[PDB]
Amino acid sequence: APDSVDYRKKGYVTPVKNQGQCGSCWAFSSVGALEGQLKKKTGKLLNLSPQNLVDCVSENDGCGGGYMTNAFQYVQKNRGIDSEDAYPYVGQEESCMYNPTGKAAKCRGYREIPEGNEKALKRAVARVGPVSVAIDASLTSFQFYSKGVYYDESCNSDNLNHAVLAVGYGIQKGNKHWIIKNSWGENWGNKGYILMARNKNNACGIANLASFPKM
Numbered sequence: 001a002p003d004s005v006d007y008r009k010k011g012y013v014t015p016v017k018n019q020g021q022c023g024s025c026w027a028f029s030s031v032g033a034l035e036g037q038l039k040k041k042t043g044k045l046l047n048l049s050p051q052n053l054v055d056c057v058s059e060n061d062g063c064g065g066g067y068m069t070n071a072f073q074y075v076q077k078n079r080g081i082d083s084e085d086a087y088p089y090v091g092q093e094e095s096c097m098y099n100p101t102g103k104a105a106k107c108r109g110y111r112e113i114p115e116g117n118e119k120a121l122k123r124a125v126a127r128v129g130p131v132s133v134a135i136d137a138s139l140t141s142f143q144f145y146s147k148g149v150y151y152d153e154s155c156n157s158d159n160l161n162h163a164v165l166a167v168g169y170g171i172q173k174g175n176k177h178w179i180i181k182n183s184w185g186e187n188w189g190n191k192g193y194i195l196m197a198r199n200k201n202n203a204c205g206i207a208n209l210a211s212f213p214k215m
């Protein structure tokens with residue numbers, strides 16, 4: 001694996017979105033990983049529909065939370081996910097309005113990264129593309145992050161409450177990091193991104209629930 005990777009530089013990453021008040025981070029994370037694999041497979045980058053997931057992944061709880069693995073399985077069994085344009089985001093739950101004419105990507109299942117293994121997560125990011133991950137995003141320090149490599153010893157790897165997208169990894173001023181795309185808008189963090197401590201004992205649980213879709 002290369003010493004550093006950044007898929008944003010390779011056109012695998014769509015603009016930062018804003019989930020708003022709805023608890024649909026799992027949908028945005030899922031969409032981002034799907035977006036990356038679509039670009040890799042077909043050469044086209046497009047916005048896929050988190051709302052399709054919120055509304056249609058029946059076992060998840062819409063704006064009340066969910067798992068990315070269930071999202072990927074839906075896209076597989078559904079034989080599609082719509083584009084954002086075909087099924088735009090409204091940030092509240094509603095009945096399922098999936099339309100196959102709006103389909104922009106398919107899924108052949110998913111793979112999970114071994115729990116807690118940041119070495120495995122690095123290798124996956126390097127080999128595959130952006131990877132969906134869950135973290136503890138509950139600390140004030142995370143909420144108001146602006147710059148640098150994020151670390152707070154109060155971060156609880158057993159409190160996975162937020163889904164984000166690992167789009168790369170690297171080092172800054174001698175401290176290794178993951179490059180993380182959030183879905184709290186471009187005004188959050190550093191233009192919507194946060195660098196999170198890497199190889200510091202799985203800080204914030206970053207490798208505890210990582211997965212990516214097969215395409």
Ligand SMILES: *C(#N)C1([N]C(=O)[C]2[C][C][C][C][C]2C(=O)N2[C][C]C3=C([C]2)C2=C([C]=[C]C(F)=[C]2)[N]3)[C][C]1
Pocket residue numbers: 022023024025026059060061063064065066067070133134135160161162163209
């Ligand atoms: C976002 N926004 C929020 N966080 C989540 O959805 C996280 C994403 C990372 C994995 C855990 C998930 C979470 O907080 N859970 C609790 C709420 C919930 C989950 C998982 C879940 C529900 C229903 C079905 C299911 F399969 C999983 N509810 C703030 C939502």
